[PDB]
Amino acid sequence: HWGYGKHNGPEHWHKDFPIAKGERQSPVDIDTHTAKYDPSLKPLSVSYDQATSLRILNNGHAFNVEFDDSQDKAVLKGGPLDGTYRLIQFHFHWGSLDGQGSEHTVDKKKYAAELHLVHWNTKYGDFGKAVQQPDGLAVLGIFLKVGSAKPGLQKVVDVLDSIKTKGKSADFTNFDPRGLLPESLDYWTYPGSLTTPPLLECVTWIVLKEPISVSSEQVLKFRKLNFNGEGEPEELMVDNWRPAQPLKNRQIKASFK
Numbered sequence: 001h002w003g004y005g006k007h008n009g010p011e012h013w014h015k016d017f018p019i020a021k022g023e024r025q026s027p028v029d030i031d032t033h034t035a036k037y038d039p040s041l042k043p044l045s046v047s048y049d050q051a052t053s054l055r056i057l058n059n060g061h062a063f064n065v066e067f068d069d070s071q072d073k074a075v076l077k078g079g080p081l082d083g084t085y086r087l088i089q090f091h092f093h094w095g096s097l098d099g100q101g102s103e104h105t106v107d108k109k110k111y112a113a114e115l116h117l118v119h120w121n122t123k124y125g126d127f128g129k130a131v132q133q134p135d136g137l138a139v140l141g142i143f144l145k146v147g148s149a150k151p152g153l154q155k156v157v158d159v160l161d162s163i164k165t166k167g168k169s170a171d172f173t174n175f176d177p178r179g180l181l182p183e184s185l186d187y188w189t190y191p192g193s194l195t196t197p198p199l200l201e202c203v204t205w206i207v208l209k210e211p212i213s214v215s216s217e218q219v220l221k222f223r224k225l226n227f228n229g230e231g232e233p234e235e236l237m238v239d240n241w242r243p244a245q246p247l248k249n250r251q252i253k254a255s256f257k
Protein backbone atom coordinates (compact mmCIF):
# COMPACT_ATOMS: atom_id res chain seq x y z
CA HIS A 1 0.00 0.00 0.00
CA TRP A 2 1.18 3.54 -0.66
CA GLY A 3 2.76 5.67 2.02
CA TYR A 4 5.71 7.98 2.66
CA GLY A 5 8.47 5.43 3.17
CA LYS A 6 11.50 4.49 1.11
CA HIS A 7 9.69 1.68 -0.70
CA ASN A 8 6.16 3.08 -1.01
CA GLY A 9 6.58 6.87 -1.04
CA PRO A 10 5.67 9.54 -3.59
CA GLU A 11 8.11 8.37 -6.26
CA HIS A 12 6.30 4.99 -6.32
CA TRP A 13 2.71 6.24 -6.42
CA HIS A 14 2.42 6.39 -10.23
CA LYS A 15 2.54 2.57 -10.43
CA ASP A 16 -0.87 2.22 -8.75
CA PHE A 17 -2.13 5.74 -9.60
CA PRO A 18 -0.91 6.74 -13.07
CA ILE A 19 -2.61 10.16 -12.74
CA ALA A 20 0.38 10.92 -10.48
CA LYS A 21 2.08 12.00 -13.72
CA GLY A 22 -0.95 13.99 -14.90
CA GLU A 23 -1.49 17.51 -16.15
CA ARG A 24 -2.73 19.20 -12.95
CA GLN A 25 -0.97 17.53 -10.01
CA SER A 26 -0.41 19.11 -6.59
CA PRO A 27 1.38 20.47 -4.68
CA VAL A 28 3.47 22.96 -6.67
CA ASP A 29 6.10 25.56 -6.01
CA ILE A 30 4.56 29.03 -5.90
CA ASP A 31 7.00 31.32 -7.72
CA THR A 32 5.87 34.66 -6.30
CA HIS A 33 7.41 36.75 -9.07
CA THR A 34 5.70 34.73 -11.85
CA ALA A 35 2.27 34.52 -10.21
CA LYS A 36 -0.08 37.04 -11.79
CA TYR A 37 -2.27 39.46 -9.89
CA ASP A 38 -5.87 38.98 -11.05
CA PRO A 39 -8.02 41.99 -10.06
CA SER A 40 -11.16 40.08 -11.05
CA LEU A 41 -10.57 37.69 -8.13
CA LYS A 42 -13.06 38.20 -5.32
CA PRO A 43 -12.20 38.20 -1.59
CA LEU A 44 -12.65 34.82 0.00
CA SER A 45 -15.78 34.36 2.07
CA VAL A 46 -15.03 32.00 4.96
CA SER A 47 -18.24 31.34 6.91
CA TYR A 48 -17.30 29.08 9.81
CA ASP A 49 -19.55 30.50 12.56
CA GLN A 50 -21.91 27.49 12.52
CA ALA A 51 -19.27 24.77 12.03
CA THR A 52 -20.03 21.43 13.72
CA SER A 53 -16.95 19.32 14.32
CA LEU A 54 -17.64 15.68 15.13
CA ARG A 55 -14.52 13.61 15.48
CA ILE A 56 -10.79 13.29 15.00
CA LEU A 57 -9.30 10.24 13.25
CA ASN A 58 -5.79 8.89 12.62
CA ASN A 59 -6.09 7.38 9.13
CA GLY A 60 -2.51 6.13 8.91
CA HIS A 61 -1.32 9.03 6.70
CA ALA A 62 -2.41 12.07 8.76
CA PHE A 63 -5.16 12.93 11.24
CA ASN A 64 -8.51 14.38 10.11
CA VAL A 65 -10.88 16.57 12.11
CA GLU A 66 -14.23 15.78 10.50
CA PHE A 67 -17.31 17.98 10.33
CA ASP A 68 -21.05 17.65 9.73
CA ASP A 69 -21.44 18.46 6.03
CA SER A 70 -25.10 17.44 5.67
CA GLN A 71 -26.15 21.12 5.80
CA ASP A 72 -24.51 24.43 4.90
CA LYS A 73 -22.91 25.05 8.31
CA ALA A 74 -19.26 25.85 7.51
CA VAL A 75 -18.83 27.04 3.94
CA LEU A 76 -16.26 28.64 1.67
CA LYS A 77 -17.44 30.94 -1.10
CA GLY A 78 -16.03 33.75 -3.17
CA GLY A 79 -12.47 34.02 -4.34
CA PRO A 80 -12.07 32.00 -7.53
CA LEU A 81 -15.02 29.75 -6.72
CA ASP A 82 -18.47 29.48 -8.26
CA GLY A 83 -21.07 28.22 -5.83
CA THR A 84 -20.86 27.07 -2.26
CA TYR A 85 -18.32 24.63 -0.88
CA ARG A 86 -18.94 22.82 2.45
CA LEU A 87 -16.18 22.03 4.92
CA ILE A 88 -15.83 18.27 5.40
CA GLN A 89 -12.51 17.90 7.20
CA PHE A 90 -9.15 19.45 7.91
CA HIS A 91 -5.75 17.83 8.37
CA PHE A 92 -2.06 18.68 8.27
CA HIS A 93 1.20 17.63 6.67
CA TRP A 94 4.41 18.10 8.62
CA GLY A 95 8.10 17.31 8.79
CA SER A 96 10.60 15.55 11.00
CA LEU A 97 12.52 18.87 11.19
CA ASP A 98 11.32 22.48 11.31
CA GLY A 99 12.84 23.14 7.86
CA GLN A 100 10.49 20.84 5.95
CA GLY A 101 6.93 19.59 6.13
CA SER A 102 4.81 21.74 3.87
CA GLU A 103 3.58 20.46 0.53
CA HIS A 104 3.39 23.73 -1.32
CA THR A 105 6.53 25.81 -1.34
CA VAL A 106 6.97 29.54 -1.85
CA ASP A 107 9.99 30.50 -3.95
CA LYS A 108 11.29 27.01 -3.04
CA LYS A 109 10.92 27.75 0.70
CA LYS A 110 9.49 24.90 2.75
CA TYR A 111 7.44 25.59 5.87
CA ALA A 112 7.33 23.34 8.94
CA ALA A 113 3.79 22.18 8.18
CA GLU A 114 0.73 22.90 6.09
CA LEU A 115 -2.96 22.90 7.07
CA HIS A 116 -5.56 21.76 4.53
CA LEU A 117 -9.22 22.66 5.05
CA VAL A 118 -11.08 20.48 2.55
CA HIS A 119 -14.43 21.61 1.09
CA TRP A 120 -16.73 20.14 -1.57
CA ASN A 121 -19.03 21.79 -4.11
CA THR A 122 -22.65 21.34 -3.00
CA LYS A 123 -23.96 21.09 -6.57
CA TYR A 124 -22.58 17.52 -6.67
CA GLY A 125 -24.55 16.34 -3.65
CA ASP A 126 -21.85 14.44 -1.77
CA PHE A 127 -18.09 14.33 -1.39
CA GLY A 128 -17.65 11.07 -3.30
CA LYS A 129 -19.36 12.55 -6.38
CA ALA A 130 -17.49 15.85 -6.01
CA VAL A 131 -14.03 14.27 -6.24
CA GLN A 132 -14.97 12.99 -9.69
CA GLN A 133 -15.45 16.52 -11.01
CA PRO A 134 -12.87 19.09 -12.17
CA ASP A 135 -14.46 21.74 -9.91
CA GLY A 136 -15.46 19.34 -7.15
CA LEU A 137 -13.24 20.44 -4.26
CA ALA A 138 -11.74 23.60 -2.83
CA VAL A 139 -8.84 23.16 -0.43
CA LEU A 140 -7.70 26.14 1.65
CA GLY A 141 -3.99 25.70 2.42
CA ILE A 142 -2.31 27.54 5.27
CA PHE A 143 1.41 27.38 6.04
CA LEU A 144 2.73 26.80 9.56
CA LYS A 145 6.00 28.22 10.82
CA VAL A 146 7.57 27.56 14.21
CA GLY A 147 7.56 30.51 16.62
CA SER A 148 4.83 31.56 19.04
CA ALA A 149 2.12 29.08 19.96
CA LYS A 150 -1.21 29.15 18.14
CA PRO A 151 -3.87 29.11 20.90
CA GLY A 152 -6.58 27.91 18.48
CA LEU A 153 -4.56 24.75 17.77
CA GLN A 154 -3.99 23.58 21.33
CA LYS A 155 -7.16 21.50 21.70
CA VAL A 156 -6.13 19.57 18.60
CA VAL A 157 -2.67 19.09 20.13
CA ASP A 158 -4.15 17.92 23.43
CA VAL A 159 -6.30 15.13 21.93
CA LEU A 160 -3.51 13.56 19.87
CA ASP A 161 -2.54 11.15 22.67
CA SER A 162 -5.94 9.52 22.17
CA ILE A 163 -5.41 8.80 18.45
CA LYS A 164 -1.76 7.81 18.44
CA THR A 165 -2.12 4.91 15.99
CA LYS A 166 -3.80 4.15 12.67
CA GLY A 167 -7.53 3.52 12.95
CA LYS A 168 -8.07 5.32 16.25
CA SER A 169 -10.78 7.96 16.52
CA ALA A 170 -12.03 10.24 19.28
CA ASP A 171 -15.04 12.49 19.79
CA PHE A 172 -14.09 16.04 18.92
CA THR A 173 -17.09 18.36 19.14
CA ASN A 174 -17.38 22.14 19.38
CA PHE A 175 -14.03 22.89 17.76
CA ASP A 176 -13.94 26.26 16.06
CA PRO A 177 -11.77 26.26 12.91
CA ARG A 178 -11.73 30.07 12.81
CA GLY A 179 -9.00 29.82 15.44
CA LEU A 180 -6.63 28.37 12.82
CA LEU A 181 -6.81 31.27 10.35
CA PRO A 182 -4.21 34.03 9.92
CA GLU A 183 -5.13 37.73 9.91
CA SER A 184 -5.08 38.19 6.14
CA LEU A 185 -7.02 36.17 3.59
CA ASP A 186 -4.77 37.19 0.67
CA TYR A 187 -4.20 34.08 -1.44
CA TRP A 188 -2.77 32.37 -4.50
CA THR A 189 -4.96 30.03 -6.53
CA TYR A 190 -4.46 27.36 -9.19
CA PRO A 191 -6.23 24.17 -10.42
CA GLY A 192 -4.70 21.00 -8.99
CA SER A 193 -5.24 17.65 -7.36
CA LEU A 194 -5.45 15.72 -4.16
CA THR A 195 -1.92 15.39 -2.80
CA THR A 196 -2.30 11.74 -1.76
CA PRO A 197 -3.70 8.80 -3.72
CA PRO A 198 -6.03 8.63 -5.53
CA LEU A 199 -4.48 11.97 -6.67
CA LEU A 200 -7.71 13.00 -8.40
CA GLU A 201 -7.61 16.23 -10.40
CA CYS A 202 -10.61 17.83 -8.74
CA VAL A 203 -9.20 20.62 -6.54
CA THR A 204 -9.25 24.40 -6.77
CA TRP A 205 -6.30 25.24 -4.53
CA ILE A 206 -6.44 28.42 -2.45
CA VAL A 207 -3.16 28.97 -0.59
CA LEU A 208 -2.97 31.81 1.91
CA LYS A 209 0.01 34.16 1.72
CA GLU A 210 0.23 34.67 5.50
CA PRO A 211 1.44 31.70 7.59
CA ILE A 212 0.28 30.97 11.10
CA SER A 213 2.87 30.42 13.82
CA VAL A 214 2.82 27.41 16.11
CA SER A 215 5.20 26.62 18.92
CA SER A 216 7.99 24.07 18.88
CA GLU A 217 6.07 22.14 21.56
CA GLN A 218 2.95 21.99 19.36
CA VAL A 219 4.76 20.59 16.32
CA LEU A 220 6.70 18.13 18.50
CA LYS A 221 3.36 16.65 19.52
CA PHE A 222 2.42 16.04 15.87
CA ARG A 223 5.71 14.13 15.50
CA LYS A 224 4.72 11.69 18.26
CA LEU A 225 1.88 10.24 16.18
CA ASN A 226 2.32 6.90 14.49
CA PHE A 227 1.70 5.69 10.93
CA ASN A 228 1.22 2.13 12.18
CA GLY A 229 -1.70 0.52 13.96
CA GLU A 230 -1.57 -0.52 17.59
CA GLY A 231 0.50 -3.65 18.09
CA GLU A 232 2.45 -3.17 14.84
CA PRO A 233 6.07 -1.92 14.75
CA GLU A 234 6.22 1.76 15.63
CA GLU A 235 6.95 4.21 12.85
CA LEU A 236 6.62 7.89 13.65
CA MET A 237 4.17 9.89 11.56
CA VAL A 238 6.55 12.52 10.18
CA ASP A 239 7.36 13.74 6.66
CA ASN A 240 3.87 12.91 5.37
CA TRP A 241 4.21 15.45 2.55
CA ARG A 242 4.37 15.07 -1.23
CA PRO A 243 7.06 17.21 -2.91
CA ALA A 244 6.28 19.88 -5.48
CA GLN A 245 5.10 18.61 -8.88
CA PRO A 246 5.57 20.19 -12.32
CA LEU A 247 3.33 23.18 -12.99
CA LYS A 248 2.92 22.16 -16.66
CA ASN A 249 0.27 24.25 -18.43
CA ARG A 250 -0.95 26.22 -15.43
CA GLN A 251 -0.78 29.84 -14.23
CA ILE A 252 -0.90 30.63 -10.52
CA LYS A 253 -3.03 33.73 -9.86
CA ALA A 254 -2.69 36.07 -6.89
CA SER A 255 -5.50 38.01 -5.17
CA PHE A 256 -3.00 40.66 -4.11
CA LYS A 257 -0.14 42.53 -5.50
Ligand SMILES: NS(=O)(=O)c1ccc(-n2ccn(-c3ccc(F)cc3F)c2=O)cc1
Nearest residue numbers: 116118127128131139193194195196197198
Ligand atom coordinates in the same frame (compact mmCIF):
# COMPACT_ATOMS: atom_id res chain seq x y z
N1 LIG B 1 -3.85 16.58 1.01
S1 LIG B 1 -5.31 16.97 0.24
O1 LIG B 1 -5.11 17.27 -1.20
O2 LIG B 1 -6.09 18.04 0.89
C1 LIG B 1 -6.32 15.46 0.26
C2 LIG B 1 -5.71 14.28 -0.13
C3 LIG B 1 -6.46 13.12 -0.13
C4 LIG B 1 -7.79 13.16 0.26
N2 LIG B 1 -8.50 11.91 0.18
C5 LIG B 1 -7.98 10.70 0.19
C6 LIG B 1 -9.00 9.80 0.02
N3 LIG B 1 -10.11 10.50 -0.13
C7 LIG B 1 -11.46 10.05 -0.36
C8 LIG B 1 -12.32 9.71 0.67
C9 LIG B 1 -13.61 9.31 0.37
C10 LIG B 1 -14.03 9.26 -0.96
F1 LIG B 1 -15.31 8.87 -1.26
C11 LIG B 1 -13.18 9.61 -1.99
C12 LIG B 1 -11.89 10.01 -1.68
F2 LIG B 1 -11.04 10.37 -2.70
C13 LIG B 1 -9.81 11.80 -0.05
O3 LIG B 1 -10.59 12.68 -0.14
C14 LIG B 1 -8.41 14.35 0.63
C15 LIG B 1 -7.66 15.52 0.64
Ligand SMILES: [Zn+2]
Nearest residue numbers: 091093116195
Ligand atom coordinates in the same frame (compact mmCIF):
# COMPACT_ATOMS: atom_id res chain seq x y z
ZN1 LIG C 1 -3.51 17.55 2.62
